[PDB]
Amino acid sequence: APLIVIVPSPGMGHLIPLVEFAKVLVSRFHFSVSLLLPTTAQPTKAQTTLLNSLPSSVSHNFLPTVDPAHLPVAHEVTISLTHAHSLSSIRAALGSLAQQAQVVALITDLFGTGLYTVARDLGIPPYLYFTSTAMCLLFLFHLPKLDETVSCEYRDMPEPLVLPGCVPLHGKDFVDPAQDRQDQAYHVLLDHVKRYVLAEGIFVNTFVDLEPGAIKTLQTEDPNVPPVYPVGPIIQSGLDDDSDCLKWLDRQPSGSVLFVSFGSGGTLSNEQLNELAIGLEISGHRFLWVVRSPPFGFLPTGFVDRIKDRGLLVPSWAPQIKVLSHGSTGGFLTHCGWNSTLESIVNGVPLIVWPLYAEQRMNAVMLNQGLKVALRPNASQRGLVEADEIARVVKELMDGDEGKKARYKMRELSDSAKRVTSENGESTKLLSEVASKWSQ
Ligand SMILES: O=c1ccn([C@@H]2O[C@H](COP(=O)(O)OP(=O)(O)O[C@H]3O[C@H](CO)[C@@H](O)[C@H](O)[C@H]3F)[C@@H](O)[C@H]2O)c(=O)[nH]1
Ligand SMILES: COc1cc(/C=C/c2ccc(O)cc2)cc(OC)c1
């Protein structure tokens, strides 16, 4: 059986998507996968659980920890430096896999581009698995040109960027690392993007129906740009441990529940949580809120008791796919990470977008202004979303007209998603078409 080597960047939001791509390759095709995991610290309980829970057809190998004195900041800088100072280790592991097995392809995420030259020299075709939107990839291919054209900090450009096929995008909504051009994060992001050209191919976790403008542009505007294969949506099955959630949801009316969840990475102040609490309570709507500390002793006086009729508070974690696929669940208040968004798209759940970090502000603009499947609260000058504004936008989504229009559009995308990932879907076919080249 041919071997595909996957080198995730350190961090769960790089690892999980690539693990799920791995599970698709071994489920649909006759391949084995070896994960080589660069690390800044010895394996976590979280990592070991996830990795030991994989099919036997997916081997894993934590690489020597990078001596933390070899570090001089943003995740972009941490991740990039982990890859650089793990290059010897990966070469060594690849060299040995290559002699003891047929390695047919290497797959990295957007920060693993250092490996591309190295993989070519050893006659292994390198591929990028892009875990965000076609719009986001297109923005990144354009960022070098944009760096030469625009000399101000991008939030001071009053004119929006209008990429072919895309919604207008104001500079304040550009990716996090591009919001300080003096930080190392910006220079590292540029260095990686300039190497995207070296990939045999770029997988994108999206589909034609969802981003036709950006996909047309990526596949036609430039011959410099590698082949681009939309093969999404790929999301976890969500069938595992935990939780009173599903019991609670079985007692609620159809489409009546707002699911409220930010990532593990999404951190709200005690102040913003308490505004969100009062805001949910006065909306009059039912809600399931995954509450992470800034167990519920920090929440407003009386609130936990006042909302027992109509809301459920979960500490730490909830079965997201099970919540979103429940018939009770009518809306999702999310940070717009792309895996959370894709889960919500394939279950037809319309959104309230509250972007926090990474490329979320761009995802928010795309979902609100482009696809019109999301609403969006207005923060006051100081950055805080007020209770009154939360209540307004919750009611607008759960009982209002803009909600109906968004839900209708989100169901249309839901049916596209089911179609493209079926036995003869565009996404299923195109992955099978690229993977077949590897089998021989
Ligand atoms: O209580 C919970 C909370 C989460 N989950 C699950 O964890 C996953 C979270 O995915 P999400 O895209 O929201 O976060 P993350 O992967 O960190 O996003 C980054 O990585 C993304 C891909 O690179 C990028 O687009 C984004 O901007 C980044 F932030 C998703 O599979 C949820 O179902 C859950 O089951 N229960
Ligand atoms: C700077 O633009 C991006 C950042 C990121 C970074 C995501 C991330 C995920 C998990 C973490 O723990 C830290 C950062 C992802 C992107 O699309 C795949 C684009």
Give the DSSP letter string of 101-133: S-EEEEEE-TT-TTHHHHHHHTT--EEEEE-S-
* Ligand 1 center–CA 391 separation, angstroms: 25
As for ligand 1, residues whose beta carbon falls within 6 Å of it are 13, 16-17, 131-132, 236, 261, 263, 265, 290, 317-318, 320-321, 337-340, 343, 358-360
Boundaries of domain holding 188: 1-232+423-440
Q: How far apart are CA 156 and CA 153, in angstroms?
A: 6
Looking at residue 137, its amino acid is L
Which one from 75, 109, 173, 326 is the annotated catalytic residue?
Answer: 109
Q: Are 135 and 362 in contact (CB under 8 A)?
A: yes
Contact 350, 410 (CB under 8 A): yes
Tokens of 294: 């800034």
Antiparallel, parallel or unpaired: β 329-334 and 311-315: unpaired
348 touches 410 (CB < 8 A): yes
Q: Is 305 part of the annotated catalytic residue set?
A: no
Give the strand pairing for 32-37 and 311-315: unpaired
Identity (one letter) of the amino acid at 169?
A: L
**Residues in the chain whose C lies over 2.5 Å from the next residue's N (breaks after):** 72, 242, 294
Residue 214 contacts residue 190 (beta carbons within 8 Å): no
How many domains does the chain fold into? 2
What is the rounded CA–CA span in Å between residue 332 and residue 261?
8
Nearest CA to ligand 2 atom 14: 75
Q: Are 438 and 105 in contact (CB under 8 A)?
A: yes
**Residue 190 and residue 59 in one domain:** yes
Structure tokens at 37: 């995991």
**Cross-strand pairs, 108:** 7, 128
Same domain, 41 and 156: yes
Mutate to test the pocket of ligand 1, among 18, 243, 320, 353 (most ligand atoms within 8 A of CB): 320
Please tell me whether residues 259 and 282 are part of one structural domain.
Answer: yes
State the DSSP H helix or E strand holding residue 59, giving kind and residue range, or none if neither.
strand 58-62
CA of 342 to the centre of ligand 2 (A): 16
Q: Would you say 104 and 3 are in contact if contact means Cβ atoms under 8 Å apart?
A: yes
Residue 117 structure tokens: 């030259």
109 is catalytic: yes
Q: 311-315 and 257-260 as β-strands: parallel, antiparallel, unpaired?
A: unpaired
**233 preceded by a cis bond (ω within 30 of 0):** yes
Counting ligand 2 atoms within 8 A of each CB, the residue from 80, 132, 184 with the most, and so the one to mutate, is 132
85 and 192 part of one domain:
yes
Tell the residue nearest (CA) to atom 13 of ligand 2.
75
Q: What is the dihedral of CA 402, 405, 406, 411, to 10 degrees?
A: 160
| Beta bridge partner(s), residue 55 | none
For residue 55, give the amino acid letter: P
Kindly list the distances between the CA atom of residue 60 and the CA atoms of 32, 34, 40, 128, 152, in Å, as whole numbers in the listed order: 11, 5, 17, 19, 45
Bridge-partner residues for 329, per DSSP?
257
Q: Do both 338 and 308 map to the same domain? A: yes
Cβ atoms of 298 and 270 within 8 Å: the answer is yes
Ligand 1 nearest atom to the CA of residue 343, by list position: 33
Where does residue 12 rank: exposed (0-12), middle (13-18), buried (19+ CB within 10 A)? middle
DSSP letter assigned to residue 3 = E
- Pick from 393, 338, 344: nearest CA to 364: 338
Ligand 2 pocket check: which of 205, 359, 361, 366 to mutate, most ligand atoms within 8 Å of Cβ? 359
User: Hey, which bits of 141-209 come out as E strands?
Assistant: 201-204
- Rg (the chain; Cα; Å): 22
Ramachandran assignment for 158, one of left (phi > 0), alpha (psi -120 to 50 degrees), beta (any other): alpha
CA of 18 from ligand 2 middle (Å) equals 13
Find the 338 Cα to ligand 1 centroid distance in Å. 7
How many CA atoms lie within 13 Å of 211's alpha carbon, on the beta-carbon side? 31
* Ligand 2 atom index nearest CA of 140: 2
Q: Which helix (H) or strand (E) holds 14?
A: helix 12-28
Question: What is the enclosing helix (H) or strand (E) of 436?
Answer: helix 426-439
Q: Which residues contact 120 (CB under 8 A, 6 or more apart)?
A: 126, 198
Q: Are residues 277 and 260 in the same domain?
A: yes
| 3-class secondary structure, 229 | strand
- Say if CB 206 and CB 134 are below 8 A apart: yes
| Residues 97, 178 share a domain | yes
Among candidates 334, 303, 299, which has minimal Cα distance to 410?
334
- CA atoms of 243 and 44, how far apart (whole Å): 23
Cβ atoms of 226 and 201 closer than 8 Å: yes
Residues with CB under 6 A from ligand 2: 11, 13-14, 75, 110, 131-132, 136, 175-177, 189, 265, 358-359
- CA 136 centroid distance within chain: 11
* φ, ψ at 126 (rounded to 5°): -90, 135
Which residue type sits at 171? G
Residues 32 and 131 in one domain: yes
Does residue 251 share a domain with residue 149? Answer: no
- The Cα-based distances of 163 to 14, 38, 196, 365, 377 in angstroms read 26, 35, 18, 13, 25
How remote is the C-alpha of 64 from its chain's centroid? Answer: 27
Specify the residue with its C-alpha closest to ligand 1, atom 34. Answer: 320
Alpha-carbon distance values, 435 to 127, 203, 377 (Å): 12, 11, 43
273, 346, 348, 408, 410 from 414: Cα distances, Å = 31, 5, 5, 10, 6
Complete edge-to-edge strand list for the sheet that includes strand 257-260: 311-315, 286-291, 257-260, 329-334, 351-353, 374-375
In a 3-state reduction of DSSP, which class is residue 97?
helix
Whole-number Å distance, alpha carbon 110 to ligand 2 midpoint, is: 9
Contact in structure between 137 and 228 (CB atoms under 8 Å):
yes
Q: How far is the CA of 46 from the centre of ligand 1 (A)?
A: 14
d(CA 254, ligand 2 centre) in Å: 35
Ligand nearest to the CA of 335: 1
Do 214 and 303 reside in the same domain of the chain?
A: no
307 and 431 together in one domain? no
CATH number, position 214: 3.40.50.2000
CA distance 42 to 68: 12
Q: What is the DSSP letter of 247?
A: H
**Closest among 292, 290, 283, 282 to 256, alpha carbons compared:** 283
Give, in degrees to the nearest 5, the angle at Cα 150 between 149 and 156: 165
Spatial CA neighbour of 90 closest among 58, 56, 124 = 124
Q: Are residues 219 and 246 in the same domain?
A: no
CA 105 to CA 33: how far, in whole Å? Answer: 10
